[PDB]
Amino acid sequence: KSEKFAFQAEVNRMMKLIINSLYKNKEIFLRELISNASDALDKIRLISLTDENALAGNEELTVKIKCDKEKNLLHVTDTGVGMTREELVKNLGTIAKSGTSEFLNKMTEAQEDGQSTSELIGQFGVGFYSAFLVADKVIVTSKHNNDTQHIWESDSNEFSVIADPRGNTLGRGTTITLVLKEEASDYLELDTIKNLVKKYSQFINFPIYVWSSKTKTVWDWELMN
Ligand SMILES: C[C@@H]1C[C@H]2O[C@@H]2CCCCC(=O)CC2C(Cl)C(=O)CC(=O)C2C(=O)O1
Numbered sequence: 001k002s003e004k005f006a007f008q009a010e011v012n013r014m015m016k017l018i019i020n021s022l023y024k025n026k027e028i029f030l031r032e033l034i035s036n037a038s039d040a041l042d043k044i045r046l047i048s049l050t051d052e053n054a055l056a057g058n059e060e061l062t063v064k065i066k067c068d069k070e071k072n073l074l075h076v077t078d079t080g081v082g083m084t085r086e087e088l089v090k091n092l093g094t095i096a097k098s099g100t101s102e103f104l105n106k107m108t109e110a111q112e113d114g115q116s117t118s119e120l121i122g123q124f125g126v127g128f129y130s131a132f133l134v135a136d137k138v139i140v141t142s143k144h145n146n147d148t149q150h151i152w153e154s155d156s157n158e159f160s161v162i163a164d165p166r167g168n169t170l171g172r173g174t175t176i177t178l179v180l181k182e183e184a185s186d187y188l189e190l191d192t193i194k195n196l197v198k199k200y201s202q203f204i205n206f207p208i209y210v211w212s213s214k215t216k217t218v219w220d221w222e223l224m225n
Contacts, residue, residue: 002162007154008094010104015129015156017107021117022130026184028118029134030193031200032127033076033176037063038204039125040080040174047081057145058171063204064221065197066211069188074135077175084147088140088161092128092152099124128176132156134187137179143170198224 007015022028041061048054055061058079066075083091090096095104103124110117121127131138140152141164149164178187186192194210201208201224209221 002160004158004160005089005093006158007156010095010101011093014095014100014104014107014126015132017104017111017117018121018126018129019133021107021111021121022133025118026130026133027196029127029130030076030187030196032122032130034063034197034200034204034208035122036125036128036176037076037078037080037174038206040078040082041206042080044079044081044172054145055172057143057168058173061206063201063206063208064211065193065209067188067190067193072180072185072188074178074180074187074193075175076178077170077173079171079173082144082170082173083142084144085150085161085163087144088142088150088152092140092154093159100126131176131178134181134184135178136181139177139179140174141170141177142174143168143172145172194222194224201225 041063044054045061060079063076063078065077068075095101103120103126107117107120110120121130137153137155141149143149149166149168149170150161151164152159152161180187190210190212194212197208197210208224210224211219212222213219
């Protein structure tokens with residue numbers, strides 16, 4: 001069932017521009033993933049204004065982050081609109097929106113003339129690729145109301161998508177799972193993550209939680225705002 005895809009040339013070029021723009025500020029990948037989560041939540045929220053049963057799959061509007069130090073994984077899960085199988089392929093593997101092309105041109109000129117680029121990344125919502133600054137593999141699990149749950153996975157050299165054999169476990173939404181590089185093990189530390197989530201979530205309009213422990217050890221979702 002697993003279908004293999006090559007990234008579109010432009011996406012390969014875009015990944016490299018992003019990586020180089022944020023190379024000395026890797027922590028920004030988290031800000032971009034939170035921003036993506038927020039936007040996805042805003043979208044399902046707007047859809048609920050016109051579709052009564054829009055939230056049926058998962059009545060919560062949240063962003064939940066968990067570290068799995070013992071598995072070397074960082075998970076960022078939102079209960080936003082999600083993506084159908086076709087949207088996974090299109091959004092992650094091609095220059096989907098008319099605007100991505102715009103970002104690509106603007107990014108190239110800005111990078112050429114020394115103008116700041118981190119803002120452009122956030123403006124066009126193409127920050128996902130910055131996850132490759134800290135991860136050897138990025139996995140995206142998503143569930144949209146119009147489709148079944150699928151998994152997209154990539155080490156940046158190609159990507160594949162398969163129907164999730166685990167069924168509908170998200171309800172609705174998306175999980176970004178990062179298999180962290182050795183040099184990035186710091187992001188597996190709850191304290192580093194909380195501090196970062198807190199620094200990048202005060203502006204978000206949705207509640208953001210991190211699976212944290214107290215220690216007898218108490219494990220639960222801690223609100224960062
Ligand atoms: C297509 C929808 C909704 C859309 O408004 C957002 C903004 C940016 C999206 C960028 C993407 O490429 C897909 C998603 C990524 Cl990468 C995430 O980290 C979280 C997420 O929830 C995504 C999504 O489901 O996005």
